[PDB]
Structure formats: structure tokens, C-alpha cells
Amino acid sequence: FSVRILTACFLSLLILSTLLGNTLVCAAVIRFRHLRSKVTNFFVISLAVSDLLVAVLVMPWKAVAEIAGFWPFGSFCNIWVAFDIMCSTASILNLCVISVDRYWAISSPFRYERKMTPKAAFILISVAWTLSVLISFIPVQLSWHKANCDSSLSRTYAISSSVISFYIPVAIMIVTYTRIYRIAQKQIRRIAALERAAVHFKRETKVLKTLSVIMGVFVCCWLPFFILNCILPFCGFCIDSNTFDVFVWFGWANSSLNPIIYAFNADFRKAFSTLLG
Amino acid sequence: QRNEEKAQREANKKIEKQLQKDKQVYRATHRLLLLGADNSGKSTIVKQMRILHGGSGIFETKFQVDKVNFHMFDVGGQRDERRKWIQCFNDVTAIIFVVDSSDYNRLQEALNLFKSIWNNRWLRTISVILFLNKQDLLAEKVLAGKSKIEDYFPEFARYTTPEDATPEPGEDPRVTRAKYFIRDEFLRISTASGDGRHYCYPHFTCAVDTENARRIFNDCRDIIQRMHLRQYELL
Amino acid sequence: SGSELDQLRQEAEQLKNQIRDARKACADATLSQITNNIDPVGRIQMRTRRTLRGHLAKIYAMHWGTDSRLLVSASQDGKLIIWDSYTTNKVHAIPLRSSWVMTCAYAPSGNYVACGGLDNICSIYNLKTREGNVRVSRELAGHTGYLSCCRFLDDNQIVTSSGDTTCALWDIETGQQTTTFTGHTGDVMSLSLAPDTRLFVSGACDASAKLWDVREGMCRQTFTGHESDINAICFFPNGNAFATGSDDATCRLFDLRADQELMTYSHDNIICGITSVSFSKSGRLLLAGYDDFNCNVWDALKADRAGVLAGHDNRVSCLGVTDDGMAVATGSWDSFLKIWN
Amino acid sequence: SIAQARKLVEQLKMEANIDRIKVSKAAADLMAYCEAHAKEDPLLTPVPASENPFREK
Ligand SMILES: Nc1nc2c(ncn2[C@@H]2O[C@H](COP(=O)(O)OP(=O)(O)O)[C@@H](O)[C@H]2O)c(=O)[nH]1
Numbered sequence: 077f078s079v080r081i082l083t084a085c086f087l088s089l090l091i092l093s094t095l096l097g098n099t100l101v102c103a104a105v106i107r108f109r110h111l112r113s114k115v116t117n118f119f120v121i122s123l124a125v126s127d128l129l130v131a132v133l134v135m136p137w138k139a140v141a142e143i144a145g146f147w148p149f150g151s152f153c154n155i156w157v158a159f160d161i162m163c164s165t166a167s168i169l170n171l172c173v174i175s176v177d178r179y180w181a182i183s184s185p186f187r188y189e190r191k192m193t194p195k196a197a198f199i200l201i202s203v204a205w206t207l208s209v210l211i212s213f214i215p216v217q218l219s220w221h222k223a224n225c226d227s228s229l230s231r232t233y234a235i236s237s238s239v240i241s242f243y244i245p246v247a248i249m250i251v252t253y254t255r256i257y258r259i260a261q262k263q264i265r266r267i268a269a270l271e272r273a274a275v276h277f278k279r280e281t282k283v284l285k286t287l288s289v290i291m292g293v294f295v296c297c298w299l300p301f302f303i304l305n306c307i308l309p310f311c312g313f314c315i316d317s318n319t320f321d322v323f324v325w326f327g328w329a330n331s332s333l334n335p336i337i338y339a340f341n342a343d344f345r346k347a348f349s350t351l352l353g
Numbered sequence: 354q355r356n357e358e359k360a361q362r363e364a365n366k367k368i369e370k371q372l373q374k375d376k377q378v379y380r381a382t383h384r385l386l387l388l389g390a391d392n393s394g395k396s397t398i399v400k401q402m403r404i405l406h407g408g409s410g411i412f413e414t415k416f417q418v419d420k421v422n423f424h425m426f427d428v429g430g431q432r433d434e435r436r437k438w439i440q441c442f443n444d445v446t447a448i449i450f451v452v453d454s455s456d457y458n459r460l461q462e463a464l465n466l467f468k469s470i471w472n473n474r475w476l477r478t479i480s481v482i483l484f485l486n487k488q489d490l491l492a493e494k495v496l497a498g499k500s501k502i503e504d505y506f507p508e509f510a511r512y513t514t515p516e517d518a519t520p521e522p523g524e525d526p527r528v529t530r531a532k533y534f535i536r537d538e539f540l541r542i543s544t545a546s547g548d549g550r551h552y553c554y555p556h557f558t559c560a561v562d563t564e565n566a567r568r569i570f571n572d573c574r575d576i577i578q579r580m581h582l583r584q585y586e587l588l
Numbered sequence: 589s590g591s592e593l594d595q596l597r598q599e600a601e602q603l604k605n606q607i608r609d610a611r612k613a614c615a616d617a618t619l620s621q622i623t624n625n626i627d628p629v630g631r632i633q634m635r636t637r638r639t640l641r642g643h644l645a646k647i648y649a650m651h652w653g654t655d656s657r658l659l660v661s662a663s664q665d666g667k668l669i670i671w672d673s674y675t676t677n678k679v680h681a682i683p684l685r686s687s688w689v690m691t692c693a694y695a696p697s698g699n700y701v702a703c704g705g706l707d708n709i710c711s712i713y714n715l716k717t718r719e720g721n722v723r724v725s726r727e728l729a730g731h732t733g734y735l736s737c738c739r740f741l742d743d744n745q746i747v748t749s750s751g752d753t754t755c756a757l758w759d760i761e762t763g764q765q766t767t768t769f770t771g772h773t774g775d776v777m778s779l780s781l782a783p784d785t786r787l788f789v790s791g792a793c794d795a796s797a798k799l800w801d802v803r804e805g806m807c808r809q810t811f812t813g814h815e816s817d818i819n820a821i822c823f824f825p826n827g828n829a830f831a832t833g834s835d836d837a838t839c840r841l842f843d844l845r846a847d848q849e850l851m852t853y854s855h856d857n858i859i860c861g862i863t864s865v866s867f868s869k870s871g872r873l874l875l876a877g878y879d880d881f882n883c884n885v886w887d888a889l890k891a892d893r894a895g896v897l898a899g900h901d902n903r904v905s906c907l908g909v910t911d912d913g914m915a916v917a918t919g920s921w922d923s924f925l926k927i928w929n
Numbered sequence: 930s931i932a933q934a935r936k937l938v939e940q941l942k943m944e945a946n947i948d949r950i951k952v953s954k955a956a957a958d959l960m961a962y963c964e965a966h967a968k969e970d971p972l973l974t975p976v977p978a979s980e981n982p983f984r985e986k
């Protein structure tokens with residue numbers, strides 16, 4: 077049908093964009109050792125890998141089930157929903173780390189350059205991935221998540237795993253970015269003092285633009301899905317499978333946007349330019 | 354034979370693990386280049402830091418503030434064409450430019466040298482910490498009233514003391530206006546063409562001043578903060 | 589006039605123009621017209637065969653040994669690492685007093701290494717020491733400027749170059765400047781000894797190169813032509829010619845016996861400066877390090893650009909060909925050395 | 930001023946009395962030393978990987 081072929085092409089384009097952006101980040105890291113040198117790059121690689129897992133593992137099967145209308149892989153999908161929870165939690169979590177990372181590298185630059193040694197970087201990456209695998213697979217294979225294949229998470233599990241995977245990271249990320257805003261606003265006022273002395277809100281707009289882009293893409297992309305994951309199993313005012321499905325796709329769409337907002341440093345740009353040519 | 358291959362391999366191991374501890378040490382030292390005219394306080398500043406803080410005249414000094422190591426170096430035996438040994442310091446955290454504020458006729462030389470340093474092709478991301486040194490001598494000359502700034506800088510006659518000035522307790526408004534005038538002549542250069550890539554942080558210092566470690570510490574910290582901001586496109 | 593100073597300035601210009609005429613007198617043809625019928629070397633695509641890591645800062649000097657296997661590298665992290673380029677093992681890692689080292693040499697006997705920099709001191713280290721750890725043995729003082737280059741003649745003779753616009757030949761044992769070379773106006777940046785130790789040339793920041801007689805201490809020939817500071821210089825394998833690279837993004841080939849420039853190597857897409865130059869064993873290949881992170885390989889006979897060596901995250905600061913011609917090494921400010929063939 | 934000018938004039942007179950050869954011959958000598966050793970330059974004529982210490986084990 078007209079709508080069906082359109083969903084097919086849009087979903088295929090979304091997957092291809094996710095795969096391309098994230099594989100580009102991973103390649104720009106593996107090829108260039110001056111990108112692997114820092115630690116913030118360690119965290120960005122972790123994020124890119126999580127989103128690439130989202131793509132290749134989780135997204136296409138749901139897209140096929142969306143096109144065909146029936147879930148054909150069958151007993152797989154037990155695994156799939158587990159896979160889903162993992163990849164979609166290694167993404168949000170990773171943002172959290174990167175956010176705290178930037179904060180720790182701006183609120184205490186000396187302590188940061190001293191204490192954040194690649195061992196601490198690996199420990200943070202380990203916490204993210206191991207928290208993901210734990211909180212995802214274990215309640216699935218033990219069938220605590222259950223109250224076409226029903227991916228409908230149990231009423232108690234929805235709120236619990238939701239609180240962790242989203243609401244602990246959104247609280248931490250909002251705290252961090254509002255602190256970074258306080259710091260950047262302070263420094264801008266200070267720099268403005270000197271230039272006004274010499275002469276005797278553009279830089280503010282730049283701060284607003286970058287913080288708003290980051291937090292607003294993350295929230296406007298992920299937040300609806302998680303307030304739904306909250307409200308739906310309790311009440312399932314209520315919504316249908318198609319609407320719940322588009323808000324799911326918003327969740328996996330953020331995994332597509334992550335490269336452009338978190339991997340466009342100038343050196344990343346130039347590495348992409350020398351890669352694609 | 355093969356034994357010598359294992360001895361060479363363990364020699365490589367002892368070397369690489371020494372280089373790993375040395376890498377962490379080198380990674381944590383903030384190199385600061387001391388630059389500036391003669392008849393200034395560079396050698397006295399290095400001498401004082403070696404004295405008052407734990408410090409390793411000589412070209413170098415190594416000192417620690419709050420578990421943060423610094424290595425400040427002043428080059429003394431060169432010519433005046435600093436256009437070529439400067440590229441050995443393209444990665445220093447900051448340049449400490451010292452200016453004899455009490456030398457009313459070598460002050461134009463300091464302004465020209467500051468302009469050439471601030472606009473150097475190999476110092477584009479290097480922020481400069483401006484020490485307007487010898488403030489006590491400046492107060493001596495201003496209260497003495499024998500050499501007035503207007504004879505060398507006629508602009509000083511129409512200059513008005515800024516409304517943001519923070520004089521220390523017990524300072525004649527004439528001295529305050531003089532030292533803030535010198536401050537704004539250098540800030541007019543730092544705020545000129547310059548770039549958004551680096552800034553100049555003036556401080557009034559004397560050779561006997563003891564907080565001249567806290568000033569370099571504070572300002573290295575601000576430079577690093579702003580480097581981390583401009584890295585994430587925030588500032 | 590009447591003032592003997594203006595008459596010496598006038599007689600100076602008169603001699604420089606009689607010399608320019610005697611130079612154009614022997615300029616009958618160009619090397620390119622003569623060598624237009626030879627075949628080009630073809631595209632030369634060398635690849636990274638080894639990568640030598642360990643340095644914590646920008647490398648500034650390197651020098652192969654006579655065995656063509658070991659090499660020393662000086663970095664501005666205050667280290668001087670000796671590599672066995674065949675097995676990538678590190679043989680020594682010498683911490684340095686002054687961290688701003690700018691040169692390092694390898695004695696032809698392999699017994700000693702040298703290095704110097706902004707400390708205005710040339711330090712000799714005995715690699716064949718008999719107890720504990722390799723440490724400092726000698727230290728040559730006297731220069732009023734920063735030491736830019738130094739190369740051994742034998743186990744006791746060493747020549748140094750400095751920013752005081754002078755070069756000096758030293759006797760390592762007595763520590764005296766056995767010979768002083770003056771005449772440059774700007775900073776002397778690089779020197780290269782002839783294959784027979786008898787003479788050596790130097791390139792300075794006054795856009796001039798000078799050929800000096802080591803034993804007599806006099807400037808034999810002065811070559812000009814660059815528009816800016818000379819950053820590198822090296823002898824042609826024959827010993828009667830040398831090539832220079834400067835910040836004006838150009839390489840120039842001078843001959844000793846013909847006493848003028850022979851050929852210029854440049855491209856209008858190349859605008860960055862040049863940091864190091866060196867010929868191959870046969871002199872057919874000229875490698876030059878540019879600030880644009882790349883290394884260009886020129887055909888010393890046709891002025892054509894022949895091959896490129898890209899791969900570096902900062903300016904390639906130095907390079908050097910082995911004495912057997914088997915490989916070339918490149919040091920850059922990304923803290924890596926790479927062997928190519 | 931006056932001493933550096935006497936030294937510059939005597940230096941230029943010394944540099945003037947060197948004997949130079951024709952550029953055609955100087956280039957012919959460079960081409961001859963080059964092609965006389967062209968076959969022994971491993972960077973120009975690549976040496977088989979068996980005798981290359983950087984391509985072997
Ligand atoms: N009175 C006074 N003299 C100073 C001050 N700072 C430096 N000096 C003088 O500067 C001299 C040191 O020589 P200096 O100019 O530092 O050598 P440089 O490092 O090459 O510039 C000392 O004799 C000090 O008397 C200061 O704050 N007050």
C-alpha cells in the first residue's frame with residue numbers, strides 16, 4: 077500500500093543513517109590514534125558502539141514486524157526484547173557518563189587531568205555496559221518483565237527499569253548541564269568585563285544553542301516513550317499499538333542523532349572528511 | 354642468541370614501564386613560559402619561586418601548588434629575534450609577560466613587544482598572563498612627581514580612571530589611575546585583533562609579592578576551564 | 589664621497605656584481621634541459637613498515653647510526669630514546685637535563701651520543717660506559733645562543749651550530765672551541781658534514797648557505813636565493829652539492845664546484861614551511877618534511893614531484909635516510925617515528 | 930662598521946677567486962654519479978622482501 081511502502085522506505089533510511097553515523101564514529105576512532113589518545117573519546121566510542129548495537133541488533137527486526145504486520149522470527153523475540161532493553165539502555169546511560177565527564181572536565185580541570193586515568197575511564201564504561209546487560213537480560217530470561225509477540229513489560233518492571241534507565245540519567249544530565257551553564261555564564265560575564273574595559277548576548281546565545289540542542293534533542297526524542305512506559309502498563313487516556321510504536325521509534329531515533337551532536341569536534345569532522353573524501 | 358632476544362625484550366619492558374610513569378608525570382606538569390623585556394622581574398620571579406615555594410635565575414623552576422605541578426622557564430641567553438626558539442613553546446599553558454611598569458620610557462618597547470607576542474603565528478592559543486611588575490617603584494615615581502606619564506603618553510591627560518577599578522587599601526587615586534592606564538594600554542592590545550582563541554589576564558605584582566603562585570595557579574585554571582569550554586563549543 | 593665606509597659599501601656591491609656576472613657566465617644550460625631525455629623514476633609509494641612509539645612530546649631530531657640499524661631520537665619531553673629500528677625494541681631511554689632539546693647526533697664509532705638545545709650546551713653521553721646506567725660524560729659550553737645542530741667527525745671532534753650566528757668545531761676532551769666559524773647575520777639553523785669530513789655547509793635564517801673548510805676555519809663559498817629562513821640542509825651523496833629547504837615552501841639545489849643554484853622544487857599547492865631534507869644513497873630521491881603533516885619525495889634530477897608520505901598528526905619535524913639506503917625515518921610533532929621503504 | 934667592511938670586502942674577494950666549472954658538466958657529473966649507483970639504491974629500485982629487514986619477520 078501507499079502508507080506501507082512509505083513506512084518501509086523511511087524506516088530503512090533511519091536504520092541506514094544510524095548505522096552510517098555510528099560506524100563513521102567508530103571508524104574515525106579506530107583509524108586515528110590522536111582520537112584514541114584522550115579519555116572523553118573513550119566515552120564517545122562507547123556511546124557510538126551502543127547506538128550501533130541498537131541499530132544492527134534491535135531496530136531492523138521491529139521494522140520488519142512493522143512492515144509485514146506479523147512477528148515471524150518467533151521464539152527469537154524473547155531474546156529481542158531483552159536485547160532491546162540492553163542496547164537502548166547502553167545509549168541513555170552513556171550519554172549520562174559523557175555528560176558527567178564533560179562536567180568533571182570543566183568544574184575541576186586540574187583534578188580531572190590528574191585523576192581520570194584510562195583505568196577510571198574503563199571502569200565507567202564497564203559500569204554502563206554491565207548495568208545494561210544486568211538490568212536487561214536477567215529479568216527477561218527469568219520472565220519477570222511479563223505481567224505478534226508481546227513485548228509489553230510488566231507493570232512493576234516498567235516503572236522500575238524505567239526509573240533506572242531514563243530517570244536516573246535525565247536527573248544526572250539535567251544537573252550536570254545546568255551546572256555547566258552556570259560556569260559558562262560566569263566566564264562569559266568575566267570575558268565581557270575585559271572587552272568593555274578595553275572599548276571604554278552572542279556568546280550567551282551560543283551557550284544556549286549548544287545546551288538546548290543537546291538536552292532538547294535527548295528529551296524531545298526519548299521522554300515521551302518513557303512517560304508512556306510509565307503510564308501504559310498501569311492503565312492498559314490510553315493509547316494504541318501504533319502510537320506506542322511511533323514513540324518507540326523516537327527512542328531509537330535519538331540513537332541516530334547521537335553522532336552529529338556528540339561526535340562533531342573539529343578533528344572528528346576532519347577525520348570524516350578524510351575518510352569519505 | 355634467543356636469550357639476547359629475551360634480554361632485549363625485557364629491556365624494552367623496563368623502558369616502556371619507566372616511560373609510563375614518566376608519561377603520567379609529564380602529563381601532570383603545566384609548562385609556563387616566562388617572557389618579557391630586561392630590566393624586568395623575570396629572573397627575580399624565578400628566584401622568588403624557588404625560595405618561597407618548593408622550587409626545583411636559572412632558566413627553569415619547578416613548583417607545586419595544591420598537588421598541581423608547574424614548570425616555569427625563562428630564557429635568558431638569547432638574542433631579540435625570538436621568532437625561532439618560540440616554536441619550542443607552542444604548547445605551553447600560558448606565557449607570563451612581565452613589564453616594568455615603573456620604566457616610563459622603556460614602556461613603549463614593552464607595548465611593541467607585547468603586540469608582537471600576542472600576534473605571533475605560533476602563539477594563537479597561548480594565553481598571556483600579564484604581570485605589571487614593580488608597582489612599588491611606580492608608586493614611588495608617581496608620588497615623587499618628577500617623571501609624569503603625559504610627557505611620554507599625552508593620551509594619559511584625557512584618561513579617566515575606570516569605574517570598575519578595585520584599588521587596594523591605601524592607594525592614591527593618581528597611582529590608581531596610572532596603573533590602570535597602563536593596564537588598559539595592554540588590554541587594548543590584547544582585545545584588539547587578537548582572537549577568541551586566547552586572552553590576557555592582567556595582575557599588578559611586585560617581586561616581593563608572595564601570592565605570585567596563586568595568581569599563576571588561578572589563571573592557569575581559568576585558561577584550562579576555557580579550553581574545556583571552547584572544546585565543547587559551550588563558551 | 590670620501591668616507592672609506594661608503595667606499596667599502598660600494599666596492600662590496602661591485603664585488604657582488606662581478607661575482608654575479610662570473611656566475612651567469614658559467615650558466616650555459618639548465619639541469620632540466622639536459623635531463624629531459626632521462627626516464628622518470630615513476631610513482632614511488634613507500635609504506636609505513638614500523639612505527640616507533642614511546643615519546644611523550646614532539647620529536648625534534650634523529651640520527652641513524654653507521655650500522656644502519658640503531659637510531660637516536662630527541663624529544664621535547666626531556667628524553668633521548670635509542671631504538672633498534674629492526675626489532676622496535678628500545679635500547680636506552682636517557683632523561684635529559686633541559687627538556688627543549690633540538691638536536692642529537694650519533695658518533696660514527698657508535699660509542700657516544702650527543703644532544704643539545706635551548707641550554708646552549710652540547711652534552712656527550714658515553715653509550716659504552718662500564719658501570720650502571722648511561723649518563724653524561726662531557727658538556728661543551730661557550731655559545732651565547734641556542735644550539736640548533738651538531739654532528740660528530742670522530743670520537744673527539746664535534747661540530748656545533750648555534751643561534752649566535754656561529755658554528756664551532758670542538759675537541760671533546762679539552763673542551764675548547766678549536767675552530768670558530770663566523771659570518772652569518774641570522775640564526776644558523778642546520779649543518780651537514782661532507783662524506784669525507786673535510787668541509788661542511790651551514791644554512792642560516794639569513795636565507796644563505798655557506799661552505800666552510802673545517803681545518804682552516806674560513807668561509808669558502810656563500811650561496812643565496814631563498815627569500816626567507818633556511819630550516820634544513822644536507823650534502824648530495826657525491827659531496828660536491830647540497831640541497832636546502834626554507835619556510836618559503838621551496839627546495840633549492842646548489843652545486844659546490846659550479847657555485848650556483850641548479851634546480852628548484854616547489855608546488856603552488858604547497859604553502860607551508862619545510863622542516864627537514866635528506867638525499868637517498870644515490871641522490872636520486874630528495875625527501876622533504878613540510879608543515880602540512882606530509883613528506884614530499886622529489887626527483888633530484890627532474891624537479892618533478894615523485895612520491896608522497898602522508899600520515900602524521902602534526903608537522904613532520906625531521907627525517908633521515910639510513911647509511912645503507914634501506915629505509916627512511918620521519919619524526920613529527922605527533923610523538924611517533926615512522927620507518928618507510 | 931669599518932672593520933666589518935674590511936672583512937666583508939676581503940671575504941668577497943676570497944669568494945670571487947674560486948674556480949667554477951660549467952653547469953652542463955656539473956649536471957653531467959650529478960647524472961653520472963646518480964645512474965652509476967641507481968641500481969644499488971633500495972629506495973629507488975625496490976629490494977625483494979627477502980633481504981628487507983623491515984618487511985621480514
Ligand atoms: N625595586 C624593585 N626591583 C625589582 C623588582 N622586580 C625586579 N627588580 C629588579 O630587577 C633586577 C633583576 O634583573 P632582571 O631584570 O630580573 O634580569 P632579567 O630576568 O633578564 O630581566 C633586580 O636587581 C631587581 O632589583 C621589583 O618589584 N621592585
Ligand SMILES: NCCc1ccc(O)c(O)c1
Pocket residue numbers: 160161162164165229233234237238241305324327
Ligand atoms: N526499546 C527500549 C525499551 C526499554 C529499554 C530499557 C528499559 O529499561 C526499558 O524498560 C524499556
